[PDB]
């Protein structure tokens, strides 16, 4: 069906706001350990944005992120594809658009914390455990999950990702 | 008594508020005898300072005055006090827990403060540690230094309800 | 005689202020003979630069020229001078103490300046130190670097009165 | 014909500046044929990028595209080119010299650039070294990283104007 | 690949800005004998419009044209498809949308100058060397080119072109 | 029955009211039916073009005919675009009354020339309305302004402004 | 008798100008009885038309109705009349000179007119020729070719003082 | 000295321009004596006209008075003069060159003029020709065909820089 990618957020529109509830639902459901209250407060925060994957008008997931352009990196907050649509390449297409978007916006480092269950998806998206950004650049901006691995992805502004 | 919490401050944009701030400055000044009253009033009434108030029957009986540094990613704890005949009751801990809840909702997860030897044990029980994860390059020159006091730090878990 | 202090500047000037700046530019130039006159003019009349003028009987006799960097949490001292025949009467010190008082009230508590062989002993007596506590990462792209002079720092105690 | 120097940039209504930025983008993309044209064009027209432009008789013959990082105490040097038919005329040296002049007025005393094998000789001659005195924690994540090329620094001498 | 057509221009918007730069590049590169500045002056001239061919976000061709409603014709100014995309039909489709646009705006005559390497393309778009529009109507409005061949195309507003 | 002539059109500055708009649809229907080799999408585009106008023949409220035209007052002539009388009203002289009302309208607007293209099934009507195959307006004046039709005869009509046409 | 020349017309209004435009309509009609006075009134009152009026001692005694086609670079002479009791006094010629002068000052240098047989001598004397320099494509269908009427042209010299 | 080029013209307005226009009227008038001064002044101060003024140290030493007919696709060259003691230094050629650059910017790529016998060699060195590409229907009447003058044409190339 018609697949479409939109970067959306709760600015400073009905279809957008309902897409955001759709996203908040998909993060909660694929990310059980994340409290629903705190997924919601982040998804609906202005300083956060989300790349929404829309299959035929209906949200089937996306990537919630927080650009820190004073720092040169972007945090990756939530990632989920709905369970009946996983292992269809949908998550890689999501990351790649996310890369393209950040290319155009001169930001070329991703940082994220990964669980042991999900680390292999980030490895397969180019992420690495070798964190070249100085600790002093991110501590107190990215939400430390202690007991999860910090990972990093460097974007090349000269490859087309999409 | 009826207990209220309220975050307040001299916005550079109310009367119940104005006297609440006067009660805080009085409370802070009386519980912190080595803080110049003039200095206390200058910070409580500064606009980039906010103050969590604790109110028992309309009457200001404690609070945490604090300074949000959202660009630097932390908050400074300016004053803490519970008035004398309301101490040792758990009020201080309900203030700190509230103040934590606020700061999660505003996506700040670090408290920096300075502690003399008589307040270190208090902050320790609010979960403050001497080990400072925040880089000096980020707080020095923004937080009021206190040579002679232990700097302390608190990291918040936004997965968690404090109140 | 009748002395007064005023923190004047050039935003977007009175006749009274315009000539005061010109007076301040003259005093700065005369007491700093190897500073190009125009460079002094371009900073005294700069909008982001302010000046604490020292007036005696209506006439400019001294001043300190400074640039506040509240986003970086320090102020840059630019020019300091007392006219020839008013020196060594303490005018120098009260000019600093007034600037320290002004800066407590704006919660900037760090001065940074460069001092050549002809002024470091002045700055030593105003509490300046060669030990720079401010991060190099915080001022390098901001303050003019007078290579060949000694970078020096003053930290302010916002709890004591300076005047 | 008369020679001009002008530091221009994208901002927020001048036909002249606009066709000079296209002139620049063209000369950059011609002398850097292994860069994406879209990358050069997205940077030249970026408003946190500036470009020193070198004019001979109304049309662009050269320029230096750069990115000032005052809160880091240096400037990233992004693109350097003089057109073919005007090279080996000391033209690229006056560009680097006006750029130093401009930057000493603005209290930036460090240049950071990457240089491959075709360019490293020229930057050595304008005074750049491989000895990077800027801490890795001041520049990493701010300057466009180029694995494979060599990071070069140039340190400027401060000056009291007039 | 997601194909798009957009009739754009420089009214007196960044996406559109970078697109005109894309267009000015493609023109300049498929038309080496055209001054790069000259192409730039006409593409960024407000009374000029370019029909862009956008393939998966990037420009891969267009037609720059000049509508002369007073005179009752339009001037074809530049046509190019990027090298690796030629002989795929893109050119013919570009003309076909451009004929479609002009039907909807009551302009039913195209005029252009073509060198020998381009006569066949315009012949295949319905262009003829027989110029029905009077010389008084076009001379000193369309830029003439000593040497090239004046070519005319007449549109049927009762036909659908796309 | 009751007969009215109205010069109407898709005025793009005042809202064409419902009465006008339903007449613009009716004329589009009539032209389409009487001119079937003309695409109906073409007819609608032109009838509703703000630079076009239409003299509507209105009988007891319903549209029974019209002459849609385009005035080129810079060029000094007018194009005749569509002519139709509905079938059950033809050969009653309605065709001619429309043309004459149209001539009388144009001499008041100081345009004294009609140009049109006619195929063999229509050349006779326009001849009876005064058109000639002999075109005094120069080619440079009309070409690429009026919709050419190859295989139609271009036909011209010159109007005398000292004459009262209706 | 006091003689005035006024270029008037029915623009986008004045009592005096209105009664004059009627006075002109009369004179033209009466002097040109074989043109429908209906048609004369239309043109005289058309706003793209103008009439230079010959006012003698208050009353309208003649004039020239003309239509400027600036985009074409010519003016059409439409009606010319002096009332009867005032003919052969040179009034026709003074009207034509004031008209020439008027057009010089508007950068229009060509007059076209279709003339009946009873008029050719008057236009000849005013410098009109039957030899027509303007191209047919510039004037056809802007001025009305009347059958049996003679097109005449007058070309004007910007450097000549006509009045 | 300081040379400037200013396209000026009456606007249907500023003392510096007005005195420049009067200066231009004198320069033209003085170099072209057998042409009515009142005609030169009418044209210079007409608003459909513009003049490319050549200023050398405050004062008018020449210019090109021209007339853009953008409906018709060309500009009319009307008066070229350089004050007598500044001639044969190239001033009139920098004048035409500037005028060509101006017109390329407005998509007017043809200049028509009626040269007198003393002017022809100048127009020839500016690229003019007696072979007129522009159809007579496009210029006739719009410009004045002075008996004895030679119609000359210049086609501008918009891909070349002229200044
Ligand atoms: C602490 C918070 C940090 C965050 O931002 S959330 C951490 C990641 N989130 C989750 O795992 C939530 C639930 N999982 C999901 O929603 C999706 O499976 C997920 C991770 C978004 C991937 O989307 P999909 O469409 O399933 O992936 P895909 O079709 O594009 O295939 C990508 C390749 O990666 C591989 N992979 C490794 N670990 C995986 C894993 N844990 N889940 C899914 N795939 C994983 C998988 O083999 C897949 O195919 P291939 O091997 O490349 O051919
Ligand atoms: C440079 C200084 C700037 C600043 O940040 S202000 C520093 C703090 N200021 C002051 O303490 C001035 C006055 N202090 C007070 O009024 C109170 O002691 C204080 C610290 C406000 C706490 O208010 P309370 O309502 O009494 O707190 P609470 O009932 O929740 O009990 C806290 C538990 O911690 C324990 N504790 C250890 N050392 C303490 C200490 N020095 N002060 C208070 N409590 C202390 C105490 O036993 C109490 O109960 P528990 O052991 O947790 O069961
Ligand atoms: C590169 C940036 C350029 C600058 O702004 S740094 C240069 C500072 N300005 C100058 O050197 C301009 C000429 N000098 C002056 O105007 C004055 O001497 C100066 C330093 C501004 C202070 O004016 P005064 O009225 O003399 O200050 P004061 O009465 O409070 O003197 C108190 C104590 O200062 C002491 N001192 C040491 N070195 C000094 C020195 N180089 N200049 C002046 N005083 C100096 C002096 O001995 C006196 O001692 P004490 O306080 O009585 O124990
Ligand atoms: C990616 C981050 C930014 C970059 O690194 S962009 C890479 C540099 N760009 C390019 O190389 C593009 C193509 N080349 C050019 O545009 C110009 O040649 C270039 C490199 C800008 C130099 O400008 P020019 O005006 O041609 O040079 P110039 O006349 O001032 O001569 C300076 C002296 O340097 C010397 N040199 C050594 N290697 C060179 C080299 N690879 N390219 C040019 N000159 C080089 C050259 O011998 C000349 O000698 P001298 O000092 O005048 O005696
Ligand atoms: C003086 C300025 C005046 C102007 O308007 S610019 C004149 C055009 N300039 C240029 O063509 C220079 C570069 N050429 C190109 O960009 C493209 O080839 C061009 C001409 C735009 C056509 O785009 P394409 O995508 O290649 O065309 P297409 O696939 O639709 O092929 C249509 C048929 O045209 C035919 N044709 C004849 N000459 C051609 C020629 N020189 N280039 C391309 N095609 C040409 C060609 O055989 C092609 O295939 P077929 O005939 O259907 O079998
Ligand atoms: C390419 C687009 C050009 C255009 O403008 S559209 C061409 C005109 N429309 C059509 O051909 C299609 C449909 N026809 C009609 O609606 C009507 O018949 C038409 C042509 C509008 C005339 O309307 P009516 O009211 O019937 O005419 P009427 O009563 O005033 O006069 C009838 C007399 O005309 C005569 N006539 C000769 N050729 C004709 C011809 N080709 N079409 C119609 N009538 C024609 C017919 O013999 C009759 O004689 P009479 O004048 O009464 O003595
Ligand atoms: C623009 C077209 C308007 C039309 O419809 S035709 C315009 C002419 N209208 C008329 O003749 C109708 C009434 N006539 C008049 O009002 C006057 O005759 C007319 C033509 C306005 C001239 O007015 P006046 O005051 O009598 O003229 P004027 O004193 O300046 O004498 C000029 C010389 O014209 C001469 N002329 C030759 N043919 C003429 C002709 N057939 N009609 C009138 N005059 C004619 C007449 O002999 C007189 O003296 P001269 O012997 O040429 O030196
Ligand atoms: C049709 C427009 C209205 C007219 O009638 S324009 C009548 C032109 N003449 C005048 O206005 C009065 C007399 N002359 C002048 O004002 C000036 O000579 C004039 C024509 C404006 C030219 O400007 P200048 O600064 O004097 O001369 P220039 O140094 O720029 O160009 C001179 C080169 O052209 C050549 N030339 C041939 N006939 C000429 C001629 N009759 N006048 C001037 N130059 C002529 C001559 O070889 C000279 O050589 P070179 O390029 O200086 O090395």
Author numbering:
A (entry chain G), E (entry chain D): 497 to 508, 513 to 662
B (entry chain H): 497 to 509, 513 to 662
C (entry chain F), G (entry chain A), H (entry chain B): 497 to 508, 512 to 662
D (entry chain E): 497 to 508, 512 to 661
F (entry chain C): 497 to 662
Q: What is written in the article reporting this PDB entry?
A:
KAT2A is the first identified histone acetyltransferase (HAT) and succinyltransferase. Here, we report that KAT2A can selectively utilize acetyl-CoA, propionyl-CoA, butyryl-CoA, and succinyl-CoA to directly deposit 18 histone acylation hallmarks in nucleosome. By analyzing the co-crystal structures of the catalytic domain of KAT2A in complex with acetyl-CoA, propionyl-CoA, butyryl-CoA, malonyl-CoA, succinyl-CoA, and glutaryl-CoA, we conclude that the alternative substrate-binding pocket of KAT2A and the length and electrostatic features of the acyl chain cooperatively determine the selection of the acyl-CoA substrates by KAT2A. Superimposition analyses revealed that all the studied acyl-CoA molecules fit in the same substrate-binding pocket, surrounded by the sheets of β4 and β6 and the helices of α3 and α5, indicating that all the studied acyl-CoA could potentially be utilized by KAT2A to modify histones.
Acetyl-CoA, propionyl-CoA, and butyryl-CoA are type I CoA molecules without a carboxyl group at the end of the acyl chains. As the acyl chain gets longer, the terminus extends to reach deeper into the binding pocket toward Loop 3, which might occupy the space for the incoming histone lysine residue. KAT2A has an alternative pocket for substrate binding. The propionyl and butyryl chain could flip into the alternative pocket, orienting the reactive carbonyl group of their acyl chain to receive proton transferred from the ε-amino group of the lysine substrate, allowing the covalent modification to occur. Thus, propionyl-CoA and butyryl-CoA can be utilized by KAT2A for histone modifications. By replacing the acyl-CoA with a hexanoyl-CoA model, we simulated the accommodation of hexanoyl-CoA which fits well in the KAT2A catalytic pocket, suggesting that KAT2A could potentially utilize acyl-CoAs with larger acyl chain than that of butyryl-CoA. The binding affinity of KAT2A to butyryl-CoA was unexpectedly affected by the Y645A mutation, indicating an additional interaction between the butyryl chain and the Tyr645 residue in KAT2A that was not noted previously. The interface analysis of the current structures showed a buried surface area of ~10 Å2 between Tyr645 and the butyryl chain, which is comparable to that between Tyr645 and the succinyl chain of ~7 Å2. Instead of the hydroxyl group that forms a hydrogen bond with the succinyl chain, it is the benzene ring of Tyr645 that is involved in the interaction with the butyryl chain.
